[PDB]
Write a protein that binds this ligand. Structure first.
Ligand SMILES: N[C@@H](CCC(=O)O)C(=O)O
Ligand SMILES: N[C@@H](CCC(=O)O)C(=O)O
Ligand SMILES: [Br-]
Ligand SMILES: [Br-]
Ligand SMILES: [Br-]
Ligand SMILES: [Br-]
Ligand SMILES: [Br-]
Ligand SMILES: [Br-]
Lengths: 263, 263
């Protein structure tokens, strides 16, 4: 059949996808900017397709409801045919690989700890051994599932705390978690992916920092519906852009060239 | 058809695959030990197959001869049907992805610089701006191809030097490169993957070190012949073992628990 505009699902997450300053006066894909906006343009060019960026309807990454078995977020939009490809900071996980296809990773990351500067915390073990400082995760993503499923002693203890903590320690968006770190003044630490942590560390008011090593090691992938013909070309495009140094260029562009906390 | 023993191609590369001390008195898979030996056992268990470890015939990772178009190394053994799966520190690259299938990565790495302690070199740019210190790569792997294909200014200059340097700066095995660093006493630096660099840094005589950041970012994958039915199960196995923390355990086992240069 004739070529057709590719529906891209993505998510408003800085610096991956952000509304341009003058977005109210702009239309279509020009409303948005960021790492994944640049990446979408490069993938489309190499694969030779036109595309339309759309923000995932429920603003979620993707989880399977245990009772109804329904997928939400960007994963759901792929599973149920509402989008042709997801170009976002979407983590490659076993449960997702079973229902959608993933390119080889375009970015590496791991779960990490964000603290308000001066917080007496250096590690996940530190967090698990105390109760003065609360901590939590994004409410429906791969980080929360990591703790839910972990059988590692320290991470198991953290999950037991987080799942029952009052008031809730989970947040609906990364921005809410950052905000809670900043205004709790050392009494909340946020568990999030090192990429987003490192980005926020370079943003004013420059009052947070990443502490300790990463808790795990994983990657983001471009996702397509299982068996989609688009998957092969997209995977080769990712590998080409990585070897060309383009992915490194985009990381430096959106994380550090634009750093607001000094050189 | 009935189940059949899976032929695994791998390569003698420390600490991935090594001859056991008493290998002369042992048979079959028991002759070998290392990260990839443990990994092979875990993958086979989760996928439910028996296997036989074999060392790649020509001792090479894999490259395509430009004139004959013939693949050598572990890639060739997969392409031409001599092995069913490769379980080794085999880098995922575009040219290889076109001819074989790769799991999602089981280990991350990047090209890195190894120096004799005290060598006045901190970066690839440092190397490219001088001639007193020679430098080279493994003779037929992904690192050499990286420099051959790079259009980045600094890496292009390094390749122009290395490809024409006299005497040859390329080595047949990692051990030869390490040996040349050690006995050139600061007048040779070796370009190799950060994983192998980090391992050697923890081995006696503790006279080398990794300097600077990595030049790129990539991963190792389990490789199967293109379209092989084994690929899907192996990929899910890799993802499961990563999320279980097994891959991290194996890295610590073979790199740092066994470190010989202190704590
Ligand atoms: N990248 C994650 C969302 C962020 C997080 O869970 O920390 C996902 O794909 O679910
Ligand atoms: N891992 C590399 C070999 C080592 C190197 O090139 O430095 C490959 O798969 O070709
Ligand atoms: Br997940
Ligand atoms: Br991955
Ligand atoms: Br580029
Ligand atoms: Br290659
Ligand atoms: Br990769
Ligand atoms: Br385990």
């Amino acid at each position: 059949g004739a070529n057709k505009t590719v529906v891209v699902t993505t998510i408003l997450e800085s610096p991956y996808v952000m509304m341009k300053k003058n977005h109210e006066m702009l239309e279509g894909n020009e409303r948005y900017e960021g790492y994944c906006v640049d990446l979408a343009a490069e993938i489309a060019k190499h694969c030779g397709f036109k595309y339309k960026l759309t923000i995932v309807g429920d603003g979620k990454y993707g989880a399977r409801d245990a009772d109804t078995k329904i997928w939400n977020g960007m994963v759901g939009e792929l599973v149920y045919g509402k989008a042709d490809i997801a170009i976002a900071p979407l983590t490659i996980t076993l449960v997702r690989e079973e229902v959608i296809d993933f390119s080889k990773p375009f970015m590496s990351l791991g779960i990490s700890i964000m603290i308000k500067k001066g917080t007496p915390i250096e590690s996940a073990e530190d967090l698990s051994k105390q109760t003065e400082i609360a901590y939590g995760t994004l409410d429906s993503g791969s980080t929360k599932e990591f703790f839910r499923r972990s059988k590692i002693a320290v991470f198991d203890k953290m999950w037991t705390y987080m799942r029952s903590a009052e008031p809730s320690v989970f947040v609906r968006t990364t921005a809410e978690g950052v905000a809670r770190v900043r205004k709790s003044k050392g009494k909340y630490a946020y568990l999030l992916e090192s990429t987003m942590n490192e980005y926020i560390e370079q943003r004013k008011p420059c009052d947070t920092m990443k502490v300790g090593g990463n808790l795990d090691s994983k990657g983001y992938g471009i996702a397509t519906p299982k068996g989609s013909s688009l998957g092969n070309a997209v995977n080769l495009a990712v590998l080409k852009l990585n070897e060309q140094g383009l992915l490194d260029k985009l990381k430096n562009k959106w994380w550090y060239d634009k750093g607001e906390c000094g050189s």
